[PDB]
Design a protein around this ligand. Structure first.
Ligand SMILES: Nc1ncnc2c1ncn2[C@@H]1O[C@H](COP(=O)(O)OP(=O)(O)O)[C@@H](O)[C@H]1O
Ligand SMILES: [Cl-]
Ligand SMILES: [Cl-]
Ligand SMILES: [Cl-]
Ligand SMILES: [Cl-]
Ligand SMILES: [Cl-]
Ligand SMILES: [Mg+2]
Length: 165
């Protein structure tokens, strides 16, 4: 089982805290989105655009279940993985760290244009708050550890988690 599975909204720090937490533990980081692009050679988008949700999610769940079983390092879950009941079911029993972030800070951390599909240019703040009302309850449900990242720098978040593992 993974040392920790990180979940949270876009920009809550899944990739960043995941990378730094993994480095600290001397283990590898497995990001489900990446495992998907590598498994299919297709980018996240093409899959969506082409196959769409149901098919992506099915693939994503497939990747998550395998990672939860084979990966012993840090696992960062794609932001929407928790919307699949099969994923929430597979997570039961695992150490799940929910990186919490306010909408104001979250939307500002993602302004990097690093490819945030569900956060188009037109009124991102409004879209981010909607995404939060929708995903937040799910993260809280699967979370075994809730970590507030609002005023904590990445190092402090990492140390906070390490202390509770
Ligand atoms: N605790 C933090 N404090 C300040 N900035 C952060 C923190 N965590 C993440 N960030 C920054 O916010 C941006 C989004 O982080 P990222 O890990 O890619 O988020 P996610 O993978 O959840 O979508 C990155 O530039 C990252 O360095
Ligand atoms: Cl399984
Ligand atoms: Cl590993
Ligand atoms: Cl995300
Ligand atoms: Cl299960
Ligand atoms: Cl600080
Ligand atoms: Mg990420």
């Amino acid at each position: 089982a993974p040392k920790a599975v990180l979940v949270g909204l876009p920009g809550s720090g899944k990739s960043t805290i995941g990378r730094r937490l993994a480095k600290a533990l001397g283990v590898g980081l497995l990001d489900t989105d990446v495992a998907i692009e590598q498994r299919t050679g297709r980018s996240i988008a093409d899959i969506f655009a082409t196959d769409g949700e149901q098919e992506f999610r099915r693939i994503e769940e497939d990747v998550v279940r395998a990672a939860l079983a084979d990966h012993d390092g840090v696992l960062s879950l794609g932001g929407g993985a928790v919307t699949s009941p099969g994923v929430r079911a597979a997570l039961a029993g695992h150490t799940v760290v929910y990186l919490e972030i306010s909408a104001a800070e979250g939307v500002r951390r993602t302004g990097g244009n690093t490819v945030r599909p569900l956060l188009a240019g037109p009124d991102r703040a409004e879209k981010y708050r909607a995404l939060m009302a929708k995903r937040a309850p799910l993260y809280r449900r699967v979370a075994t550890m809730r970590v507030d990242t609002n005023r904590r720098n990445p190092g402090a978040v990492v140390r906070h988690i390490l202390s509770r593992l």
